[PDB]
Design a protein around this motif. Structure first.
Motif, PDB file in Angstrom:
ATOM      1  N   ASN A 199      22.288  -6.533  32.716  1.00 30.51           N
ATOM      2  CA  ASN A 199      22.309  -7.984  32.578  1.00 30.51           C
ATOM      3  C   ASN A 199      20.959  -8.592  32.909  1.00 30.51           C
ATOM      4  O   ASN A 199      20.490  -9.501  32.216  1.00 30.51           O
ATOM      5  CB  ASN A 199      23.395  -8.561  33.485  1.00 30.51           C
ATOM      6  CG  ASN A 199      23.228  -8.136  34.938  1.00 30.51           C
ATOM      7  OD1 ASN A 199      22.115  -7.949  35.426  1.00 30.51           O
ATOM      8  ND2 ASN A 199      24.344  -7.965  35.630  1.00 30.51           N
TER       9      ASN A 199
ATOM     10  N   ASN B  67      18.219  -7.203  32.521  1.00 32.76           N
ATOM     11  CA  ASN B  67      17.253  -6.826  31.501  1.00 32.76           C
ATOM     12  C   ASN B  67      17.448  -7.802  30.355  1.00 32.76           C
ATOM     13  O   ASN B  67      18.394  -7.692  29.575  1.00 32.76           O
ATOM     14  CB  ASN B  67      17.462  -5.381  31.064  1.00 32.76           C
ATOM     15  CG  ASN B  67      16.434  -4.912  30.055  1.00 32.76           C
ATOM     16  OD1 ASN B  67      15.815  -5.712  29.360  1.00 32.76           O
ATOM     17  ND2 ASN B  67      16.248  -3.601  29.971  1.00 32.76           N
ATOM     18  N   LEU B  68      16.526  -8.746  30.249  1.00 32.02           N
ATOM     19  CA  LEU B  68      16.438  -9.639  29.115  1.00 32.02           C
ATOM     20  C   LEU B  68      15.715  -8.948  27.978  1.00 32.02           C
ATOM     21  O   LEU B  68      14.931  -8.023  28.193  1.00 32.02           O
ATOM     22  CB  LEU B  68      15.728 -10.924  29.529  1.00 32.02           C
ATOM     23  CG  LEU B  68      14.524 -10.714  30.452  1.00 32.02           C
ATOM     24  CD1 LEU B  68      13.284 -10.219  29.755  1.00 32.02           C
ATOM     25  CD2 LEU B  68      14.230 -11.988  31.194  1.00 32.02           C
ATOM     26  N   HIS B  69      15.992  -9.379  26.762  1.00 35.97           N
ATOM     27  CA  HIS B  69      15.260  -8.851  25.627  1.00 35.97           C
ATOM     28  C   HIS B  69      14.262  -9.925  25.236  1.00 35.97           C
ATOM     29  O   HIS B  69      14.595 -10.857  24.503  1.00 35.97           O
ATOM     30  CB  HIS B  69      16.207  -8.527  24.482  1.00 35.97           C
ATOM     31  CG  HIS B  69      17.407  -7.740  24.904  1.00 35.97           C
ATOM     32  ND1 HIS B  69      17.325  -6.454  25.390  1.00 35.97           N
ATOM     33  CD2 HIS B  69      18.721  -8.061  24.908  1.00 35.97           C
ATOM     34  CE1 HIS B  69      18.538  -6.019  25.682  1.00 35.97           C
ATOM     35  NE2 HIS B  69      19.402  -6.975  25.398  1.00 35.97           N
ATOM     36  N   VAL B  70      13.033  -9.787  25.721  1.00 33.13           N
ATOM     37  CA  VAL B  70      11.869 -10.421  25.125  1.00 33.13           C
ATOM     38  C   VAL B  70      10.711  -9.449  25.247  1.00 33.13           C
ATOM     39  O   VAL B  70      10.258  -9.155  26.356  1.00 33.13           O
ATOM     40  CB  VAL B  70      11.533 -11.773  25.765  1.00 33.13           C
ATOM     41  CG1 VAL B  70      11.348 -11.659  27.251  1.00 33.13           C
ATOM     42  CG2 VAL B  70      10.292 -12.313  25.135  1.00 33.13           C
ATOM     43  N   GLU B  71      10.208  -8.990  24.122  1.00 34.79           N
ATOM     44  CA  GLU B  71       9.200  -7.948  24.015  1.00 34.79           C
ATOM     45  C   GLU B  71       8.671  -8.016  22.593  1.00 34.79           C
ATOM     46  O   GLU B  71       9.123  -8.868  21.823  1.00 34.79           O
ATOM     47  CB  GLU B  71       9.793  -6.577  24.355  1.00 34.79           C
ATOM     48  CG  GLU B  71       9.969  -6.333  25.838  1.00 34.79           C
ATOM     49  CD  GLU B  71      10.708  -5.067  26.151  1.00 34.79           C
ATOM     50  OE1 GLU B  71      11.259  -4.464  25.211  1.00 34.79           O
ATOM     51  OE2 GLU B  71      10.746  -4.678  27.338  1.00 34.79           O
ATOM     52  N   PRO B  72       7.715  -7.179  22.197  1.00 34.37           N
ATOM     53  CA  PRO B  72       7.305  -7.200  20.792  1.00 34.37           C
ATOM     54  C   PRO B  72       8.433  -6.888  19.833  1.00 34.37           C
ATOM     55  O   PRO B  72       8.399  -7.351  18.688  1.00 34.37           O
ATOM     56  CB  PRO B  72       6.204  -6.137  20.747  1.00 34.37           C
ATOM     57  CG  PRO B  72       6.457  -5.288  21.921  1.00 34.37           C
ATOM     58  CD  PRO B  72       6.887  -6.241  22.963  1.00 34.37           C
TER      59      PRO B  72
ATOM     60  N   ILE C  98       9.354  -3.877  18.427  1.00 32.83           N
ATOM     61  CA  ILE C  98       8.756  -3.049  17.396  1.00 32.83           C
ATOM     62  C   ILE C  98       9.674  -1.877  17.121  1.00 32.83           C
ATOM     63  O   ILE C  98      10.185  -1.236  18.045  1.00 32.83           O
ATOM     64  CB  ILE C  98       7.363  -2.573  17.819  1.00 32.83           C
ATOM     65  CG1 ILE C  98       7.468  -1.801  19.133  1.00 32.83           C
ATOM     66  CG2 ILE C  98       6.464  -3.760  17.963  1.00 32.83           C
ATOM     67  CD1 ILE C  98       6.215  -1.085  19.529  1.00 32.83           C
TER      68      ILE C  98
ATOM     69  N   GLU D 267      13.193  -7.159  13.181  1.00 30.85           N
ATOM     70  CA  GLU D 267      13.946  -8.327  12.743  1.00 30.85           C
ATOM     71  C   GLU D 267      14.479  -8.160  11.328  1.00 30.85           C
ATOM     72  O   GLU D 267      15.641  -8.480  11.058  1.00 30.85           O
ATOM     73  CB  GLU D 267      13.070  -9.568  12.837  1.00 30.85           C
ATOM     74  CG  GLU D 267      12.726  -9.985  14.256  1.00 30.85           C
ATOM     75  CD  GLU D 267      13.945 -10.392  15.068  1.00 30.85           C
ATOM     76  OE1 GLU D 267      14.835 -11.065  14.507  1.00 30.85           O
ATOM     77  OE2 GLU D 267      14.011 -10.051  16.267  1.00 30.85           O
TER      78      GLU D 267
END
Lengths: 857, 293
Positions: free
Chosen positions: B46, B48-53, B55, B224
């Protein structure tokens, strides 16, 4: 215990059974026993109401209490009742929905006062939700809604709710305030005390910093509705913590105001909210032992002035009248005094374990010299429950020992203190050392901070008794008072805080200056200390002291003397100097880019040296803000493949960039995904803690956090008459930032970066407005180099004022005539055109002729 | 690795002799250097947010080597199975088989996220050997290296498989494991031997190679844009359902060979068989018949 049982036996069927009993108990009971544990039921019931299929009979239990409990009560409870039913609404299916309407219609008719008066916030939110039809269906009373709405001001309420920790009501209030502020800027009603909520919002985000990312985001979005708030006007915030030096010893009258100041402040709000079921037994006792002065009921229940004291806050009156008759002794303990641990003993386990424990086990100091008659001696029963609350009472007790000025108790303190002062530091294990020791210090200093506050009033009290300074006993106290500063050993405590450098900087400055100031004065003493101040004054964030101090002592190598030149309005010479060393060295190339960016040269650092992870945050920031779509892809394409980042800083800067591009592809859906994705980071890793004194220190954070919303809000425009009508809102919005430059520049430039990328005809006609707006800043902001470029770049639109606006900026430059000839020509140019404003015919000729005199005769 | 597969199978004949062996121990080792693909944890923090490149191209090279390996395994055995009568006994030894357990036992997890591309090839080994064991006689040199502890372990880990009901419409979606075998969209590509799934990214594998500069590092695909009809639901479903028409044909072999003496059959698969048997008889009749699939 049952509902909260460890479920070795599980069997939630009992939980169904429990609500039966406390549904029955209220059916038949005395009013006081109806109140009684009411603090407990609400907790113990709402922890039932949150569980899956048991939710039904929960609401069934509630419609009971709502009918008959108290009209003056149903404050401390209905809150957790309303916030819940608004969030879970989707989960209520057919039936549970029905019972809710059975509560509200009662809440309508049964209470026509409470919601309208005692809890005015309740009525607005539930009406605010259009889906429940309380405004639509049911009563005509919405005229009362319209009445009560305009009257009451919501700002103070939001500061009150957010302070509680209940993950629903705190999620609710943020939802309203959002929908609240959006309505304001449309009608732009109040320009503002809006600062209080901004103080509270930034507290939550720091509390949930680890927990519940997705809420902690929404907490950040809402302050972006605010946007900088112009420090210049209202600094707001406050000073510091709560010590309340009430001089508890003797002075029976003065002892009391402390006692009531404790109960309605650190006691009721401790016992009321917190869940520690068995602890609740101990809280009442000391409340009783406190009320033991007022204990006899008829004394408090009959005679007019025999009490006469408020004795409770309006909320604190809840548990006031319940326990006045109680007095539960519960004092049984086995060998507390024989268990005494002294002389740095526990300090071994402190550094071994801790933050809590060292102070917790410091209850051994409590139960030793406390728990005998007096007044606060009952508080031994409080810490008996054991705990960050101990910290509150920690000084008060820590006072009592050396207040006495039997003997060995005092000297037993310092043994742990010097053990706390000198831990030998250099602790191999950080996790414990980083964590507890800070609290230790923060607890350590707290006494010292208190004594100063203490001894100041302590003499200033008897200063009303005058006699200049004459006391026999205060001497031994004063002799001991400063003796508590002997353990400081001057530089020992100076360096205690200097090797620690806790987040309290001004105290970190004081002693650090203090030692450096008087006693040593020695050469190497000024060697290390001075270098610390630079780091110190750096963080306070007011560059004045940083300048003046770094000017005087200075020395070192003459390269430093060349570095300082920035602040002096000379930087254009100093900045010309660093470019030399850059083209030629790990920290050199950093100092260059930092300066250039600090003085707001954006067009440079994109194009200069950046074609080593410390530079990207600077580099990728500029190119983002400059805004050429082509130069920007090159960055992102370079960032994306590192096979790692792990930098909190560039991730914020990237995610803005990867948005802007998606504007150029006409993907409003996509650009929402990144702009939101920015917030979760900006409101988690970059949010500071609470106070942090000055607001101006924040501008770098909020300025980046104001522009976002614009980029989200413009990119949410549909077309044309929405767009053109939209920017007017964003136009007006810019007024609240004040006149200051760097907050304004970063904001308005980020509009350019957007307003190019769209490349539709409507974007254009604004892009010629933005620049010329940026011209009027730079000029009267005392930078003509930023102005000319901008104004030059809008000459392609060849506006009628673009010419004169140049003739402006030159006439500030020393060369007078070359300016003047322009308006000499223009003024006669419009002559015989016989068009445009004829009001604009004035604007030139005003500026024209006033030049024609001061300039030449 | 792919190009090595085209080498292995070309015209196998008796050409390959031990060349398979030294190939196998390598690849069976190479698969061991790569863990963190197949050992990933099931639940995400929880906090651990997902904001990163975000890739995708450093995953795609992680997956290809995993998958393409597990075919080359199957590619070996299928080739070895083409070699003369008693020639088989040359290959197998405690060295080769012990090495293999740590592959299979690595694939099916039950502590970790499943990966549906290996599971096929992870089984086909467990099949092909038990298909060859019966054929040529003198069973694994009287099962020189087969350990009841070893063997029965490899089977007791299939019982967990049969119990996942593969609802045809939940295939591609994300959810918890042991529910169903989902086959997430991020890794679907044809592998080598067989075309398993519609491989929406079957064409991205040429988008990471640039094609001018002669470069070492990939060209940075983005997560994406990878991946309107349901029908590809049915196919991957059907093509998945065969797997449970396989694990059956593991069993008949297993019953033929060992003659019931060991603890394998005493584990009473009739417990797990019937519990599977009764289920479909419940669901097929109630919720399916008539829906035209």
């Amino acid at each position: 215990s049952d509902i909260h049982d460890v479920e070795g036996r599980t069997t939630y069927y009992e939980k169904l059974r429990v609500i039966n009993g406390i549904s029955f108990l209220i059916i038949y009971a005395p009013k006081k026993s109806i109140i009684s544990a009411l603090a407990q039921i609400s907790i113990c019931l709402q922890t039932g109401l949150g569980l899956k299929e048991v939710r039904y009979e929960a609401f069934r239990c509630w419609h009971l209490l709502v009918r008959h409990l108290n009209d003056e009560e149903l404050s401390t409870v209905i809150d957790s009742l309303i916030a819940f039913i608004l969030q879970k609404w989707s989960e209520f299916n057919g039936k549970l929905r029905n019972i809710v309407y059975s509560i509200l219609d009662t809440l309508i008719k049964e209470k026509s006062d409470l919601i309208l008066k005692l809890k005015p916030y309740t009525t607005l939110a539930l009406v605010g939700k259009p889906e429940l039809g309380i405004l639509a269906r049911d009563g005509q009373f919405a005229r009362m809604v319209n009445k009560i709405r305009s009257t009451t001001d919501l700002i103070p309420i939001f500061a009150n709710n957010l302070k509680s920790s209940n993950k629903y009501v705190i999620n609710q209030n943020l939802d309203d305030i959002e929908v609240y502020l959006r309505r304001k800027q449309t009608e732009r009603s109040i320009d503002f005390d809006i600062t209080l909520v901004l103080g509270a919002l930034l507290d939550t985000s720091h509390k949930f910093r680890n927990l519940d990312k997705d809420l902690c985001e929404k907490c950040a979005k809402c302050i972006s509705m605010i946007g900088v708030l112009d420090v210049t006007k209202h600094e707001f915030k406050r000073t510091t913590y709560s010590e309340n030096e009430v001089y508890d010893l003797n002075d029976s009258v003065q002892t009391i105001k402390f006692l009531i100041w404790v109960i309605n402040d650190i006691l009721v709000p401790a016992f009321w909210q917190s869940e520690n079921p068995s602890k609740q037994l101990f809280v009442a006792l000391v409340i009783q032992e406190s009320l033991k002065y007022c204990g006899l009921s008829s004394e408090s229940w009959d005679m007019n002035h025999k009490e006469l004291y408020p004795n409770e806050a309006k909320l604190w009156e809840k548990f006031n009248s319940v326990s006045k008759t109680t007095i539960y002794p519960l004092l049984s303990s086995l060998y507390l005094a024989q268990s005494w641990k002294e002389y740095v003993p526990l300090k071994y386990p402190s550094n071994n374990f801790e933050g809590y424990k060292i102070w917790v086990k410091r209850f051994t100091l409590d139960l030793l010299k406390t728990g005998t008659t007096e007044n606060h001696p009952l508080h031994v029963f409080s810490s008996l429950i054991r705990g960050s609350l101990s910290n509150f009472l920690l000084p008060y007790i820590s006072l009592d020992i050396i207040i006495k000025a039997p003997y060995a108790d005092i000297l037993n303190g310092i043994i742990i203190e010097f053990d706390s002062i000198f831990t030998c530091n250099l602790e191999g294990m950080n996790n414990l050392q980083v964590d507890s020791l800070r609290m230790c210090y923060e607890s350590i200093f707290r006494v010292f901070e208190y004594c100063k506050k203490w001894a100041t009033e302590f003499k200033q009290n008897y200063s009303k008794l005058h006699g200049t300074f004459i006391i026999k006993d205060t001497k031994t106290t004063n002799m001991l008072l400063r003796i508590d500063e002997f353990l400081r050993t001057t530089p020992s405590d100076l360096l205690a805080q200097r090797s620690l450098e806790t987040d309290s900087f001004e105290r970190s400055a004081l002693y650090l200056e203090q030692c450096y100031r008087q006693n040593p004065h020695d050469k190497n003493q000024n060697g290390q200390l001075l270098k610390n101040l630079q780091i110190t004054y750096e963080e306070i964030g007011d560059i004045d002291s940083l300048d003046g101090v770094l000017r005087t002592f200075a020395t070192g190598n003459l390269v430093s003397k060349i570095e300082e030149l920035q602040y002096s309005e000379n930087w254009k010479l100093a900045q010309d100097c660093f470019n030399v060393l850059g083209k030629f060295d790990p920290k050199t190339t950093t100092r260059m880019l930092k300066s250039m960016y600090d003085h707001q040269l954006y067009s440079q650092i994109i194009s200069n040296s950046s074609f080593v992870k410390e530079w990207y945050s600077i580099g990728l920031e500029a190119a983002n803000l400059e805004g050429n779509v082509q130069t920007l892809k090159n960055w992102v394409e370079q960032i994306e493949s590192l096979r790692n980042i792990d930098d909190r800083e560039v991730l914020l800067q990237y995610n803005i960039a990867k948005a802007l591009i998606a504007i150029s592809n006409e993907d409003p859906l996509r650009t929402q995904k990144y702009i939101h994705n920015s917030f979760r980071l900006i409101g988690t890793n970059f949010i500071t803690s609470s106070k942090e004194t000055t607001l101006l220190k924040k501008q770098n954070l909020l300025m980046k956090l104001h522009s976002l919303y614009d980029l989200s809000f413009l990119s949410s425009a549909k077309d044309k008459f929405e767009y053109k009508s939209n920017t007017t809102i964003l136009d007006y919005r810019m007024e609240r930032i004040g006149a200051d430059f760097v907050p304004n520049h970063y904001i308005l430039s980020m509009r350019k970066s957007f307003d190019q990328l769209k490349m539709n005809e409507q974007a254009d006609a604004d892009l010629g407005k933005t620049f010329f707006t940026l011209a009027q800043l730079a000029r009267n902001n005392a930078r003509l180099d930023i102005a000319s470029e901008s104004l030059m770049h809008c000459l392609e639109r060849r506006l009628p004022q673009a010419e004169l606006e140049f003739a402006e900026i030159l006439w500030k430059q020393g060369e007078n005539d070359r300016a003047l000839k322009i308006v000499q020509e223009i003024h006669e140019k419009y002559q015989e055109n016989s068009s445009v404003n004829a009001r604009d015919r004035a604007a030139v000729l005003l500026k024209f002729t006033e030049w024609l005199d001061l300039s030449n005769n | 690795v792919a190009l090595m597969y085209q080498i292995v199978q070309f015209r196998p004949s008796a050409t390959h002799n031990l060349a398979l062996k030294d190939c196998f121990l390598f690849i069976c080792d190479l698969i061991r250097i790569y863990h963190h693909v197949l050992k990933v944890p099931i639940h995400e923090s929880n906090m651990n947010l997902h904001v990163e490149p975000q890739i995708f191209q450093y995953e795609l090279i992680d997956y290809l080597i995993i998958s393409y390996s597990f075919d080359l395994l199957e590619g070996i055995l299928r080739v070895l199975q083409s070699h003369p009568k008693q020639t088989y006994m040359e290959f197998f030894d405690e060295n080769i088989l012990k090495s293999f357990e740590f592959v299979y036992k690595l694939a099916l997890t039950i502590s970790y996220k499943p990966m549906v591309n290996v599971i096929f090839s992870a089984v086909e080994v467990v099949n092909i050997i038990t298909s060859i064991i019966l054929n040529m006689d003198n069973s694994s040199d009287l099962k020189s290296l087969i350990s009841g502890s070893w063997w029965r372990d490899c089977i007791t880990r299939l019982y967990a498989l049969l119990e996942k009901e593969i609802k045809s419409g939940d295939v591609y979606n994300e959810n918890v494991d042991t529910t169903t075998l989902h086959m997430s969209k991020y890794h679907d590509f044809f592998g080598l031997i067989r075309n398993i799934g519609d491989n929406e990214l079957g064409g991205l594998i040429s988008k990471l190679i640039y094609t001018d500069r002669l470069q070492s590092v990939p060209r940075v695909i983005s997560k994406e844009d990878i991946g309107t009809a349901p029908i590809i639901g049915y196919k991957m479903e059907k093509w998945l359902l065969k797997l449970k028409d396989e694990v059956l044909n593991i069993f008949e072999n297993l019953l033929m060979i060992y003659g019931d003496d060991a603890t394998i059959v005493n584990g009473e698969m009739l417990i797990h068989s019937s519990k599977f048997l009764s289920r479909e008889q419940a669901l097929m009749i109630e919720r399916y018949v008539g829906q035209d699939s």
